[PDB]
Amino acid sequence: IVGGYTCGANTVPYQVSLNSGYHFCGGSLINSQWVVSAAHCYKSGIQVRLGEDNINVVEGNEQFISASKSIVHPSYNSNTLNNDIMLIKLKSAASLNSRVASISLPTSCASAGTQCLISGWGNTKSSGTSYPDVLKCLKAPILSDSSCKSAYPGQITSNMFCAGYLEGGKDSCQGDSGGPVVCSGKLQGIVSWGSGCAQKNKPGVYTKVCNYVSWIKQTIASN
Ligand SMILES: [Ca+2]
Ligand SMILES: [Mg+2]
């Protein structure tokens, strides 16, 4: 997250860190047994880490649970990143408490102008590399689809939306991939892609979760 702030320990209780010997993507807990992340974060051998703040220090509120199965969306296209979403089932149910909570799926899509909270342990520099050890947060609004499509001609589908600041300065970045975009208490997006980070006229692109609620509900109930 570039131009964001330190969230504070366990203030984003549904945020998860996917680890394969190191943190490589974020995710969101949707219930005690399931996590949603981005399909481009797919890897075999994932351990889901819940209740994390500093990912390099065991502070006492973590729960590390291995994944039993991963399901990438049936229509995920790695070349265009269309349908960039995946579900991960935990081998054991997480213990929900104040520090570990699930986030609600949306009943409708959010409007342009709605402010959301984006979080993650990704890069914090636009030009350079600095990976933080504690969770960073960013409040950003959903942008109109017209400004989103003008920034990326021929690359935005109805399963994506842009959020951020066209002036640049504030954005999600690599390492934040797969993490949550929560607006009005519902999980509306997943950090998917963008052009560099925090660049002028290059906002971040997010998977539009409201288009996948039936697939999510149906898939978790059958697995
Ligand atoms: Ca920790
Ligand atoms: Mg994240």
Q: How far apart are CA 173 and CA 185, in angstroms?
A: 23
**How many Å separate Cα 198 from the centre of its chain?**
17
Q: How far is the CA of 1 from the centre of ligand 1 (A)?
A: 18
| 3-class DSSP state of 195 | coil
Q: How far apart are CA 183 and CA 203, in angstroms?
A: 17
> Catalytic pick from 17, 23, 73, 84?
84
CATH 2.40.10.10 in the chain, residue ranges: 1-12+103-210, 13-102+211-223
Q: Which amino acid, 1?
A: I
**φ, ψ of residue 189 in degrees (nearest 5):** -150, 170
Contact 135, 6 (CB under 8 A): yes
Tokens of 146: 């017209």
Q: Is 133 a catalytic residue?
A: no
Q: How far apart are CA 105 and CA 116, in angstroms?
A: 14
Tokens of 73: 């969306």
- Please enumerate, as own/partner, the contacts of 61-68 that have beta carbons within 8 Å and a separation of 24 or more: 61/9, 61/10, 61/99, 61/100, 63/94, 63/95, 63/100, 64/19, 65/90, 65/91, 65/92, 65/94, 66/90, 66/91, 67/35, 67/91
Q: How far is the CA of 174 from the centre of ligand 2 (A)?
A: 9
Contact 50, 16 (CB under 8 A): yes
Taking phi over 0 as left and psi of -120 to 50 as alpha, with beta for the rest, 68 belongs to alpha
Q: Is 73 a catalytic residue?
A: no
Q: How far apart are CA 73 and CA 79, in angstroms?
A: 14
The answer to whether 97 is annotated as binding is no
Q: Is 84 a catalytic residue?
A: yes
Q: How far apart are CA 14 and CA 32, in angstroms?
A: 10
* Architecture in CATH of 1-12+103-210: Beta Barrel (2.40)
Contact 120, 175 (CB under 8 A): yes
The CATH T-level fold of domain 13-102+211-223 is: Thrombin, subunit H (2.40.10)
Tokens of 162: 């842009």
Q: Which of 198, 195, 76, 185 is nearest to 125 (CA)?
A: 198
